[PDB]
Amino acid sequence: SEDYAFPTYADRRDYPLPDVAHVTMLSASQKALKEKEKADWSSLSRDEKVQLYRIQFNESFAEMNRGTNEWKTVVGMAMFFIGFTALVLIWEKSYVYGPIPHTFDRDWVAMQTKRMLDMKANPIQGFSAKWDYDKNEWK
Amino acid sequence: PSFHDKYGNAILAGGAIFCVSTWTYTATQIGIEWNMSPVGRVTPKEWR
Amino acid sequence: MAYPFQLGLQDATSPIMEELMNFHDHTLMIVFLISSLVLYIISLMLTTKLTHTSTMDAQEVETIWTILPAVILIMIALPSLRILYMMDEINNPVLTVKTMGHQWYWSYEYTDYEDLCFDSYMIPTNDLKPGELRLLEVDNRVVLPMELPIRMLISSEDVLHSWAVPSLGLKTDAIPGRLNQATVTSNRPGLFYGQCSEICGSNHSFMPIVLEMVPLKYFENWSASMI
Amino acid sequence: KVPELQKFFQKADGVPIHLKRGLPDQMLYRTTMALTLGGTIYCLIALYMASQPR
Amino acid sequence: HYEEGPGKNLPFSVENKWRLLAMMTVYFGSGFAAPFFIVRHQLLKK
Amino acid sequence: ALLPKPQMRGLLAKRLRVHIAGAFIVALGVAAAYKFGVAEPRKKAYAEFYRNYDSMKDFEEMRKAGIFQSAK
Amino acid sequence: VHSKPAREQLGVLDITIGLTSCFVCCLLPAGWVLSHLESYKKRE
Amino acid sequence: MFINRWLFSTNHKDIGTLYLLFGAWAGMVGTALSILIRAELGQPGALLGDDQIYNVIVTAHAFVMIFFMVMPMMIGGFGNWLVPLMIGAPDMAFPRMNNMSFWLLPPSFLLLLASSMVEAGAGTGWTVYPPLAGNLAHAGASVDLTIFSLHLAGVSSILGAINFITTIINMKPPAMTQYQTPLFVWSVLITAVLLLLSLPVLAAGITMLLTDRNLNTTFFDPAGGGDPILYQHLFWFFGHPEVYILILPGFGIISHVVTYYSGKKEPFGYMGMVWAMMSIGFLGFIVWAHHMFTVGLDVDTRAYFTSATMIIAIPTGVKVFSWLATLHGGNIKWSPAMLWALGFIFLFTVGGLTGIVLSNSSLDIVLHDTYYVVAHFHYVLSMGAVFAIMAGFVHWFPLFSGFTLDDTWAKAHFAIMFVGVNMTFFPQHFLGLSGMPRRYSDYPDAYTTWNTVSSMGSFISLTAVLIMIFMIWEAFASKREVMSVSYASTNLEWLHGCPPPYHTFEEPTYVKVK
Amino acid sequence: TDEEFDARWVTYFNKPDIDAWELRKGMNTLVGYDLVPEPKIIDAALRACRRLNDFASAVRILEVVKDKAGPHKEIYPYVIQELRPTLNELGISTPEELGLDKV
Amino acid sequence: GGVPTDEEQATGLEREIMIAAQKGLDPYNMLPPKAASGTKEDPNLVPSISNKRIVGCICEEDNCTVIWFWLHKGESQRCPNCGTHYKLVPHQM
Amino acid sequence: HQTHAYHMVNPSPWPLTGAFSALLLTSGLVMWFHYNSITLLTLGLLTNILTMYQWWRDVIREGTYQGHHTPIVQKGLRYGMILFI
């Protein structure tokens, strides 16, 4: 039942040669090609080369460490539920929040605008600095 | 032979158009008062 | 006063605050140095296709890896001790003024001659004059003269508050039964806005401090003008 | 009385160590579970009546 | 003896996806809604 | 026909030292950009404020607004 | 970490049911209290 | 049977499972409290009307996410899960007080909710400042319910610390010393030391404030000779050691997960690693008055404490450079938890740097109890610590359940936190630079931009925790099992399989004679 | 130094009692080092893999050299162009024409 | 007198560990094991009762990461990094 | 059969009894200090006294009548005692 006993296959380039093979079960013709592999090396062709590689270990690096579209689909999901979040914002703005305070009317924000320009509030860099007091218009 | 070959680009395109549409909706269509900076184009008028 | 879309801090008024924001900006390009270091390292660190999982020795980085943080933090801390020296510098006590945190509002006292005590509250939103700030305007603003070292003597009645003026950048904690001295100097006229700055109940957001820089001749005319 | 109490305890019968005595220890066991559960029910109902205004 | 295995070492049974769904949704719904009911209760009292 | 001998060893070592040199130079570049952007402009704006700034005259030109509680 | 295929491979619809259930079971309680806030504010 | 296995439990694995579920409970309650705060602070004006209720929910926010999930997973559940599985211990030395800690946690939770149920409401903030929590401003039972809940949480932490030190020294095989073992031992060792050497001051504080309130002593009342600075000094003497309790197990687990997912067989600079850990533990006691830079303390003490905060900032930098050295030169497999690790190291770095800016003394004088302090600890513990928490939670989820968690949804979630917490808490940075004090429900009109965009970011955090509830459901639904795990040669905890059985380490670990 | 490093590596790979497990251990701890391995070291590894008949582990360490070439792909042509006599007297081909370089 | 001694008072697991101590044996791992031998002809012997066993090798002097693995009743297996040998033997009754 | 030299602690309801007993005691102190009750206090004090009573009776039972206290466990107990003190 438990399989942490026998050492387990795990193909990765950090430990590029795992201790255990991929397909431990070996058929009759597979045993024949294995004993031919144990024999002289001058009579082996490409298809049995690649099949013996693929039957002893699973993958090769030049086809496993490939950049897939997993980053594409996860950033798509991230900004997709960002879209659902914006829908939640629409729902709660429509139903949960009440009226704005009267302190945000255009005439009223003009009132405080003239107020802190008359006060020269943070006039060095912040707000009154971008305003001219000679021609009475923004710099 | 996976999910990310074609469903991945379908999801990214659909989520792209959906999210940009709903965020332009939240930014513009409701018209919530952001209290933007009144520098440049917003003008005051006199008060007592 | 704070303006919408405020990126940095409030522009300084006091010379101590211009020094403080200079030291602040010193810490700011230091933190941008180290943030740029960690970002460039992490980027060109994750974008590497090379592996080295052998026993690389670790007892060869101690001296440099501990002297560079030591020197960068010590030249951070030397202006900090210097500005603490300008915190506890010798005062020339030109004026004093007392304040008390009364229960969710403030009180101010000028007791040098013809003792004056008054209470300051929050002008409500419905009772706001047309053209005043929300949550800041006060029926009795505290008024101080031009370019004089003046010590705020803070205390509180039944709960600790904090006299907080970010437009002078000083917040000092009014403990009950304990008055603390905080000197202020300024050089520019007008209104300067702040709050109290610890939790003290169910109108905690509803208690500002508005401070009025006037010339001292008009200040003494004002003091004669109440009483 | 230590060795006879020891061979009284290790019967290897598998019942846990708080049930080595018999009827009096399950007596105290049952009355302590009853009183602690009654106490925590009375705490929760007292907190619920404390929550509700008069 | 205690019987072990994946998932069955957890206090809630994982014998059925729909029943586990129902239990998790009602439990986490109560957990999410508890302080909502709290703040509702004090604004009733106030 | 033939190839020269490139580096076998120390490749990541020279890569990391040239990259931490790049890290130091880009950090000082970021700080210098931040300085030239905002930092010494604070000193400057304070200077052209205060070399000709007159606080009492400032007080009159927001005093004709008639806003001060102490100045009617 | 090598892992076996999902013992119960949730179908396209099944995943949606679980996702919607979580969203609905969370939004409804909050929205319900927020919806009655106006009547709540009113002190009777 | 169920009442024997799960109520009457004496095994650390199931106590840790109960810890994890109670932590999920408290975390969801806390994020709902934060959403109440953020929804009240979304618009100018008052959503809840009176902000006494706002003070109650922000102090409930503070208590529930300072005391009720962070120790339960990050110290409690992760600790009693993994510490036997990496030491070699069959079980706790002290499982009945592991059970004290766990089973006195929900009484503390229930007394906190009872404090909420009290008509007065314990609107005092995270800290329990007199005379705000005194007999006049807060004449009610809610403050006493909070005090007794904190009593039970404190004794929970005491008995947990006693168990953790006893297991961390006693359960060890004799041939291996304290310097032959990976970073879980040193991490939970130093944090349990900080618990043991910090919590009695908190217990003392709540006791004499308790007798200040009920049976009438005058320890903090200045009308009869008391001083609130006494409670101030002792409570921060607790607070910053409890802060480093909140930051160090994250360091241990984050170093382990960086070593695992960087492919390193050994974490680089292990001697320097543990030296930095014990330096932080030994020096965190005498840095407590960095919150005291504006109360009225002497400038000699202020200079000493700001120098001490520089000196405690040094080994944190040693820790960060050690993390990068561990990450250097490896097969970098893109696990979601490694992304959590990168987010942790960068964002915790910038949060601690903002804290260094705060610990500049006059910068604290201009920035005390300000939203910049919020921006500090909300990059640091609200998100750095919990990013470590989710990194461990999705790292050892097969060890906790037997099933795997879906990596696609996991890294999409790391993205959704990433954008959400940046757009939530960087605006607070802007707000603290603008300079409003903390504990406010209504704000001046100039803060609307940053307030609203942080509200959107908080709702992003809502849909993120919805993805958590969802992915735990679908992981339990698919219930697919592992076949192989990497680096089990250097990871003892993965050797018993996913999950470890009821009786683990029946035969203790054989060790080299050397 | 590097000379005795390579000398002990080639003696380790040319000991007559080599087997697959310990050559696997040696190759893994060679990969753990921060170095592209010497063509003589690869040659000795190929002699060992000839001695106990491991085509697939031999082409695996070849593509390990290929992925250890890093961002620049001139190192592997160098390694193979010293390895040409060795490959055609062992008879082994490399993945770049036996079909594992691609997907 | 009146104070009892260990051989009359201490019982159970105390009895097995104390009689094992007075014969100089460690059947329940009170002390670190002995007979270090990493060679082929003399492997490192591990006493047990079962097929299955945890070992953790500090297989280089003053090491950080303990190399843990699993022993089975069978042929001697070795550390995957240093090369100390290990056998299991079933006699820890 | 166990092989380690450590005491395997059997399941116990005494954590539950002590936990709800401490909760009862805390509720008693606050209930007395705010609403003047005595009965819940009497229940809480008696249930703590008994809870530690047969808790420590169980401790002695597993200690001296079972002999599970290997000296490794004993020195761990001394460590717990010095840390508590």
Ligand code: HEA
């Ligand atoms: C896990 C939680 C956590 C952690 C690690 C810290 C870490 C630090 N904290 Fe913080 N802190 C809190 C949680 C935390 N804090 C909380 C909850 C409060 C609120 C209390 C209240 O309500 O009043 C608080 C408050 C607080 C204040 C109160 C401000 C006020 O009075 O209002 C101050 C100021 O001194 C401070 C300072 C620091 C410092 C200097 C560190 C340092 O330890 C930071 C170290 C971490 C780093 C990441 C260092 C970065 C440096 C490097 C990486 C080296 C490289 C740099 C160079 C080479 C230049 N903290």
Ligand code: HEA
């Ligand atoms: C860990 C502690 C923690 C966490 C996560 C948070 C999270 C958040 N906090 Fe926090 N906050 C505090 C601790 C915390 N806070 C403290 C201590 C105070 C001071 C109180 C005082 O002023 O007195 C405070 C104050 C505070 C204020 C007070 C400002 C004021 O009133 O003036 C505000 C408002 O913006 C705020 C907002 C938020 C927001 C929007 C989040 C969001 O990040 C919410 C998101 C949270 C999560 C996503 C939780 C993640 C957990 C899980 C997902 C469960 C994991 C469990 C398992 C895997 C089993 N917080």
Ligand code: CUA
């Ligand atoms: Cu007064 Cu806050």
Ligand SMILES: [Cu+2]
């Ligand atoms: Cu602190």
Ligand code: NA
């Ligand atoms: Na509000």
